[PDB]
Structure formats: C-alpha cells, structure tokens
Amino acid sequence: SANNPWTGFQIFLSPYYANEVAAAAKQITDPTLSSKAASVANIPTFTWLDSVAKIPDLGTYLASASALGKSTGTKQLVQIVIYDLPDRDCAAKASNGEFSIANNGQANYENYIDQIVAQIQQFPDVRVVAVIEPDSLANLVTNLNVQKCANAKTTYLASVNYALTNLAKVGVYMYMDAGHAGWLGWPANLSPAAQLFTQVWQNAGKSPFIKGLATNVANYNALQAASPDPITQGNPNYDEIHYINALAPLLQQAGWDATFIVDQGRSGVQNIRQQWGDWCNIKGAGFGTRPTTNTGSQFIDSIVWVKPGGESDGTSNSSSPRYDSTCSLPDAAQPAPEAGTWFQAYFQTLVSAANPPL
Numbered sequence: 001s002a003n004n005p006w007t008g009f010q011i012f013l014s015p016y017y018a019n020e021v022a023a024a025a026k027q028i029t030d031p032t033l034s035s036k037a038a039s040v041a042n043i044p045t046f047t048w049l050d051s052v053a054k055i056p057d058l059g060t061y062l063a064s065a066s067a068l069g070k071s072t073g074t075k076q077l078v079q080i081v082i083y084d085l086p087d088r089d090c091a092a093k094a095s096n097g098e099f100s101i102a103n104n105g106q107a108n109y110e111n112y113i114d115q116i117v118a119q120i121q122q123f124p125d126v127r128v129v130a131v132i133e134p135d136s137l138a139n140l141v142t143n144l145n146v147q148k149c150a151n152a153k154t155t156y157l158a159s160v161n162y163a164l165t166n167l168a169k170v171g172v173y174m175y176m177d178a179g180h181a182g183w184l185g186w187p188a189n190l191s192p193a194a195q196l197f198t199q200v201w202q203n204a205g206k207s208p209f210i211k212g213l214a215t216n217v218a219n220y221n222a223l224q225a226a227s228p229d230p231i232t233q234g235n236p237n238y239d240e241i242h243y244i245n246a247l248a249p250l251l252q253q254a255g256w257d258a259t260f261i262v263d264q265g266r267s268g269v270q271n272i273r274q275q276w277g278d279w280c281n282i283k284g285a286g287f288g289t290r291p292t293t294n295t296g297s298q299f300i301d302s303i304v305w306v307k308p309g310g311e312s313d314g315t316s317n318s319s320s321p322r323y324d325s326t327c328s329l330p331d332a333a334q335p336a337p338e339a340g341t342w343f344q345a346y347f348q349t350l351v352s353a354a355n356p357p358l
C-alpha cells in the first residue's frame, strides 16, 4: 500500500524485553555467545499488554519514545500487542488470563481498552502499531466446536470491535491477528477467514488505521521455505508467503486491500515439529529474519518480531491449572515455566541457533 506505518520512523526498542535480555545475557558464560545474546536487545520487538498491570508501563514507553525522538531528531514508533480478551485462549489452558466472560469480562475489557486509549491520546508525536488479539478471531473460523470458543464468539467479536473502533480514534495503526499458514492457510479455511475478517473490518467502520492482518504470531513457520516442512503435508500453503498470497486477494475481492505483517522471531530453524499443530516451546528454535520492511511481497508491510523469544509459551508442569499437554511432547523444551515468563535455556538456544546468525 501507499502508507507503510514503519517508513519514516525509528522503532522504540522494548524496555521490557531489553531488561529480560540484559539479565539473560550476563548469565551466558561464553563471551561471544553472551555478546550476541546482549545484542538481541537492539532488535525491535512488540511489547505485550497481556494484563491491565502492563498499562502503566505503556505510558512510560510512549513518554520515553517522545523524548528519545526529540533527542535524536527522529519520529518514534511504539509496537504493542493488545492481548487481554475475557476467556482468553478458548481452545487451551496455557494463556488463560485475568478476565472471564461470566464476570463482567466484556465490560472489563472495554475499560482495559479505555485505559490504553487514554495513555496513547497524551503522546500524539509518537506513532503506535498494535497487533490486535493473537489467538482470538482465528478460533472463530475453525474452532467453533470448542464449546468455550463458541460461547466466547459474541464477546470476542464485540471486544475486538471495541478495540479497533476506539484505538482508531487515536490513530493507532492496527493489524488483526490471523493465525498462520497451518491454521487459516489451509485452502478450505481461506474463504471463511476472509469473510470473517471482512465482517470485523466492516463492523469497525472500515477505518483506514486498520491496515490488515498479522500472521505467524508466536509460531515458527517460514516466511519463504526452501522446501516444505513435512508437517505441512496436504496443505499447498506450506509457509507464510503462500498463505498471504492466497488470502490477500480474497480480502481485496471482498473490498479490503489489506496488508500484512509476519512474525519471524522464532522462525530461524525449520523442520523441528512432529505435528504442525505443535506450538509449545518448540525445542531447538532459533531467532529468525530480523524485522525489516524489505519483505519480498507486495502484501507484506514488515517482517516483525511479535512473540518475544525467551518468554515461555506454556508451563510443562502438569499440576498447573494452565497446563497444556502440548508442552510435554518430545518437541517441547522441558521443564518450561508459565506462559509469558522467562525461559532462560530456551533463550540461549534461540541465540545459538539464530538464522541468520547474530
């Protein structure tokens, strides 16, 4: 499209990830691996607003970015993830969150959005790009036989709509989560997905700040695979570029010339899964292609790092109420801590296995 949100801006580096990375690096014993690990803090990532507790820090990021831009002659861009739906993670347990549909969840979510909007409104000289609710709308394509997802459908749609409609009022550039090639990229899922995303876009008023979709968030697929990963058998869309090439024209035909961003933060190492659905702390992953607007596709505004490598996908402790057995598979690194918390050995492997090398 004409307007790529990243062009003309410097990305504000996540202080949250920088603090995790600095602490992680100083414990890595080899001087060279440690210096490579420390350098990860200079790679732009998305910072997740996975609870109301993260909102005050958003305010600090915006104010720090504003001052950094003034100090360096630049316009700054802050990258955030909106990730606090009620009944969050309807198809599994590892990422269940603080709000529930049964306890005023939609209303609580509105207030979460209102607090975020109130921060963003105070810093108009900082641009914000937001990924909207990973692992939400994609469940309403394929997972409606999951009763928790079926019962969450109206709330997910209403809450995502509230986020889109009200973040647009403060000029936030938005990419809605859209799963990955092995989820919505199956040919038969493309049209239902396009129909849903178009309905969501319509309900939110077709705002131009709603730029498009984010794919591969927290996943491990290639953008452009050298050869199909054997987990992809049966699906001609074996990587993210095939998925996006197939979905984007459907959105165009439906009236929305959407563009895309693609997570590659844990995509450096391919062919490390037994089943494509495997997702939890996949063993041996490496940091992938660095964020860039040189994407190789008309449809893709940026390669990005959305899931911050080193933060766990889920606990492997079967006593936890957030335990998903996907996290004890032979392709899951174990033992692993609760989703979102730091997993030091996994981070060190991501550094060691980075491709391209750090």
Ligand SMILES: OC[C@@H]1[C@@H](O[C@@H]2O[C@H](CO)[C@@H](O)[C@H](O)[C@H]2O)[C@H](O)[C@@H](O)c2nccn21
Residues within 6 Å of the ligand: 048, 049, 050, 089, 092, 094, 095, 134, 135, 217, 218, 279, 280, 307, 308, 311, 312, 313, 314, 339, 340, 341
């Ligand atoms: O992608 C959204 C979440 C994600 O955890 C989420 O990661 C975020 C970034 O580290 C954290 O802020 C969250 O606390 C955590 O729940 C998992 O990494 C992924 O495997 C998954 N599967 C279902 C939900 N989720």
